[PDB]
Design a protein around this ligand. Sequence first.
Ligand SMILES: Nc1ncnc2c1ncn2[C@@H]1O[C@H](COP(=O)(O)OP(=O)(O)O)[C@@H](O)[C@H]1O
Ligand SMILES: Nc1ncnc2c1ncn2[C@@H]1O[C@H](COP(=O)(O)OP(=O)(O)O)[C@@H](O)[C@H]1O
Ligand SMILES: Nc1ncnc2c1ncn2[C@@H]1O[C@H](COP(=O)(O)OP(=O)(O)O)[C@@H](O)[C@H]1O
Ligand SMILES: [Mg+2]
Ligand SMILES: [Mg+2]
Ligand SMILES: [Mg+2]
Lengths: 360, 366, 366, 393
Amino acid sequence: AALVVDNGSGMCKAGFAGDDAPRAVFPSIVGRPRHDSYVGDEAQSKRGILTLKYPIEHGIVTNWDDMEKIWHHTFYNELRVAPEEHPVLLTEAPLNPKANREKMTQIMFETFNTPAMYVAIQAVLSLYASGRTTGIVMDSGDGVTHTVPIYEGYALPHAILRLDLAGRDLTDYLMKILTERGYSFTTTAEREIVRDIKEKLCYVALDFEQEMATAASSSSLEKSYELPDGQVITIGNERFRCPEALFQPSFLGMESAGIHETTFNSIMKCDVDIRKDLYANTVLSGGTTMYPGIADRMQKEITALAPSTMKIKIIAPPERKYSVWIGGSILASLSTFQQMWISKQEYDESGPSIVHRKCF
Amino acid sequence: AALVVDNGSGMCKAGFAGDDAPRAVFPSIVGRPRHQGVMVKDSYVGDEAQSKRGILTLKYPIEHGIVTNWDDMEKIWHHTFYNELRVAPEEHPVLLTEAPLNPKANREKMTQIMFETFNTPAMYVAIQAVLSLYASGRTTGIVMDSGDGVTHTVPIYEGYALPHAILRLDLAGRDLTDYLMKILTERGYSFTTTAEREIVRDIKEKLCYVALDFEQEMATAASSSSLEKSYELPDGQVITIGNERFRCPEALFQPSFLGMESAGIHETTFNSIMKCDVDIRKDLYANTVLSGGTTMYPGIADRMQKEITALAPSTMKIKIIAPPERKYSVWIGGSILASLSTFQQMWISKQEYDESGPSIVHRKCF
Amino acid sequence: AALVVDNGSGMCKAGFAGDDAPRAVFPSIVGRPRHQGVMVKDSYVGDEAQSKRGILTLKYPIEHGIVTNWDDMEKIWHHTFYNELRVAPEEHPVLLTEAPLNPKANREKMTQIMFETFNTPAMYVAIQAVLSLYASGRTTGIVMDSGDGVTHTVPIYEGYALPHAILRLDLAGRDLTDYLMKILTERGYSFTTTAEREIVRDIKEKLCYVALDFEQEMATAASSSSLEKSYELPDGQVITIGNERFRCPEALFQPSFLGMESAGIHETTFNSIMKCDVDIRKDLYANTVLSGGTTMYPGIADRMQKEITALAPSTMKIKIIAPPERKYSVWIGGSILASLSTFQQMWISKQEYDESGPSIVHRKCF
Amino acid sequence: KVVRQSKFRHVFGQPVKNDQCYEDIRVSRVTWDSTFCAVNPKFLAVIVEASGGGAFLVLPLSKTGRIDKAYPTVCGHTGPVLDIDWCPHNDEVIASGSEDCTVMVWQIPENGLTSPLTEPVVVLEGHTKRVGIIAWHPTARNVLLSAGCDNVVLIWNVGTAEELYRLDSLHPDLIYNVSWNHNGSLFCSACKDKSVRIIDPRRGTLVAEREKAHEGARPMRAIFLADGKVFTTGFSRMSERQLALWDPENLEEPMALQELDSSNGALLPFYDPDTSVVYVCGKGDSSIRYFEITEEPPYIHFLNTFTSKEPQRGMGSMPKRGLEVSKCEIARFYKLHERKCEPIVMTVPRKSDLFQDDLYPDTAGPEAALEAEEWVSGRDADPILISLREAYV
Ligand SMILES: Nc1ncnc2c1ncn2[C@@H]1O[C@H](COP(=O)(O)OP(=O)(O)O)[C@@H](O)[C@H]1O
Ligand SMILES: Nc1ncnc2c1ncn2[C@@H]1O[C@H](COP(=O)(O)OP(=O)(O)O)[C@@H](O)[C@H]1O
Ligand SMILES: Nc1ncnc2c1ncn2[C@@H]1O[C@H](COP(=O)(O)OP(=O)(O)O)[C@@H](O)[C@H]1O
Ligand SMILES: [Mg+2]
Ligand SMILES: [Mg+2]
Ligand SMILES: [Mg+2]
């Protein structure tokens, strides 16, 4: 029985190989009292007196001691399994620094004593869940957004683009614009409330300027949300202004281009002979791509950029929030994957030189 | 002659363009009687409410920089034009000030009242952090204003503002005044009524200061009486305060004293700079400008320089610019801007607003 | 007094004929503000855009040796004559430099701008590779000039150029600067904005070097800290880089690092020699001349000599000539050529161009 | 009293959405400082690069989005095209001057071009050098003006291919631009000798002249206003771009002289006679400044500036008949990038959704008042005015 653990910036999904959905999904949050530590949903329930901190910021480890707490919470508190009795499949961000991968390998083999372990690129696993071997995966998670083109199973690192704009930036932007309506959220506890608001009432408009016009001359686009303490707040144009930062990073003062142009630019960096198939296999992944209407807006924007003769097809499966995890479960069940396993007895005699190879 | 009106959470400064100091500085309070009249005006605004506060219930129309009740807000403006300045608002254009990242709904009400209720011929709204930079004669610097309701840190580089780097702190003079009461009951003095709010606030403005080393100042105050001062209450009673002089302003640097999770003003200023581009952080370190009445404590500049230096890299030069008239920096900057010959193209006519609406005031402003 | 202007992809060097160094060396960028002005010039070029780059979006008008925007290109030239050289273009002959195998359309635009926009009295266009040979005092040799946009290998024998043997490599300083940014994120440092591109370029010019043996240094850097250097960011932050010092310049010899299938600069130089006649290959092996800023990395001469020797026959003598002033070899060669008594016959008058057109500049040139 | 009375102090620019732009257009790379764009309520004409000779792209306004690289173009000239201009009295007739020293007038089908157009209706040959200035007469039908680098101005009859008048001994240097007056009896010209001239073509005499209107050596422009005044843009001795208003009755000193900035590139003014608003647009600049011409001093009131991030290579202005009145339109500008044509929307912010009588006075119509034969005889007439209220939806 193999374990699949996909460590994201905000959510850490864990489960067992061969399953269809993650058995354990909890926020990657370490909370400490401000009036000795709480991790995950136990921090989420007591966040009234806790100072919530994310151990991952922009896909970068800021505190490895908190990271071990997240992993300790997965094995013993959520999965309820012994890490030394199950092979564990890890997921890594594209262009993952070899220093970051080594620490992941070192912790798993020395602190948790796992028998077998393997690290896979999140973009590759996202394509397995869709049953494809060719296409560009735009995985937008909590910390960072990546565009990884893939052709016939071959990865092209030179065409991988990174956008420092993801779910956390949208959540912080929603708080900034919510004060324009009169609701003030400042503490880290209120960040989760705003994030909960973003996941329920936000959506991507097909056109932004027109959506401003109807929201400024009609009350059909307003929705009501209930706070934990009972006050009901209403939001109008903030529903689609927050996700618009994905396509217009200038709202956040950022100079880089939107996630539609980043996807197009990553294709433009590929060879000419493969661009046609990448246009027709644009795969969305991550929780930041779960906004209603994000697929239609993506298709309209990329079509305006791509030549008229190319068929833009945005693939947005309904379970794309767990595509990375689902792809990991399928890999951990394939018969051809057993030769990818890295043994503990192999690591202690060889070191991280064997994990830098046998991986990508 | 243009009018410059700076309506803060606690104080409202008004005057004429071209002057060096506000002509009218009165508290932004509205008082209503709480007893019954037995001997043969239902509200008082400004100094007249402060003098009769013994029988009134003082209410601040602005709290945390948001206007709680607009009906008393119009009374503040009405008192300003007719009773303090004693001018006709329909004759002089009015230059108004707004907090950074002001909601467009709040700005819309502010201009609509001016054009419809007071019938001002022209009107304009400017960001308070911008005028505070005009008073110091600079084009680059991070302005940390601290008034009565809220604290803003606005970095500006070469006349370009960075809205994404603007940070807010829900901690200002009113919160410190409330905190001083909580620690004053420790010494045996009880202040509870809104009338006593102005008494405690007056104590804070006269006896409080910022200690360079907070832990050392506790050690000195716990073993000596050199730090004790005496204050006379309006009824003639004399009270003495010790370590409360510098414990109250310490909430600005340690918001945990109020149970707040946010960081202090020194870290908020530092975090605002780090949100800017790397190539402009060098100038922002050497052009830190203080503004507002809450930055008038003795020794606040020295403590600010020490704290930011410990956070900033050693090779950067930290300069805390604290002009002695920083309590009126926003108004002084407003008078300077309203007198420049290049500002007459920014006025918004009453006629133009009638035919166009608030669409033209959202533009032409920032 | 003739003017020698060398317009490169990243830098523009200008001066007067007869001098030994360019009087004006400024980056060839155009910067435009990316924020809004909140207090009382829409474009910045040259060093002025470098000092204000924290609030501008820097664009290179020349990309891969191709002018992407002629409206920005004329700004660079206007800055050169009026702001850097501070001279009137209509009073001095201007000697321009062009890339090898330059498109005839590009040369047409360059000639047209000088004669109608700046109204230069005389003008001539010279091949950058030929000028680089003038500065070294040679008439025979293969010039491998690597600038910011494109790498060229031009063999010249006894004053005769071999156009069929000229090879082009789309890999230069700008491609290395982008590659250094990608690998710096592996160490935790994030540079994304165009303003941060210049900072990374500054790091590349100071701490990068070419390893004599790439693999043996990777083992040294992974088992020692002797190759680690520290760099100070403009905001005072200090970054440390290790193996990235020689991994970025290694991309010149291993273009597969950037996903490019073309050969390295060592093989491109060797392939260009093999494309010439057999009789002249001996002289080109002993007169390999380096030029451009991308060949200024310490230890690039020995690595080039080591690689070419492994490709060339054992009896051939490989001699890489890398003068210490090779960063300005194109300009210095231009100054030498513009001062020769036999060069005045090559000038093209404005009156001649007005009555004859661009047919006369395609001739009289190469 | 505090604020100058005006209706356009709050006019703001707004670029049109991407799907309504025109992409993949090989915009011309000719150093000549022309508008590079001519637009009428029916078609859009853009000067493009051709492999050989010269051509300009004419496409219907509805043909938005990306444009085929093989889209048919008007490729009849043997040299690059310099200037294009639609016929004010015929929406399917456009004249073009090019490097081949010839002026060609074309007839565009109602649906546009299905095949490349090579044969013109009439070929105007009267010049020895390149023709870069073409200006249709505002009221005279089939009367066209051509000015070339040979410093000669010709009056053409496109109906009969007849040269009416030849003006050769009036410009000693290069001609920058030529603009007719309101009734088309005179025309102003800016010359390379820094002199502004007002010339009567019928009589062939110099009505007025101002030497050293701008001290700078950089190119300058000059247009005629509705009231008969001349608005000129130029450079000072310190390379400062300036605007100036001139009175033909006394040219000793200008009524106004305002400096803008220290950038390069000529200033191309776009005058709107109904609103008395001049739009000053610089070649290669990324901003558009518009000023209101009035009788109150300083006679030039800066209104506001539209700012963008892309330099402009060309710009064309839609006439009054083509704007959509229902949304308070006063001007629509087709800003030209290097590979894209982006329409620009300028509106007056108004709360009322009804037709605005004050914003839209009667405009010159597509009906010519006089004819070529009557104009030569000595007749002068103002353009026939029409009402835009019928265009309100
Ligand atoms: N239904 C939803 N709509 C919009 N955003 C969502 C939704 N569900 C989750 N998100 C956002 O997606 C972000 C990242 O989710 P996820 O893809 O799990 O990130 P990671 O890959 O780092 O685990 C979260 O910050 C969350 O706010
Ligand atoms: N000399 C002083 N020392 C300490 N605090 C002061 C002093 N003067 C004023 N304050 C405090 O500053 C607060 C706000 O003053 P001000 O800067 O006018 O705010 P606003 O901008 O809201 O009008 C007041 O509540 C007052 O308590
Ligand atoms: N000492 C140096 N070390 C490494 N790179 C350098 C050095 N000096 C200049 N360069 C690089 O050379 C590049 C181009 O310089 P240059 O030869 O002037 O190009 P061009 O010919 O296009 O003007 C610059 O981008 C710069 O990064
Ligand atoms: Mg993820
Ligand atoms: Mg204030
Ligand atoms: Mg060069």
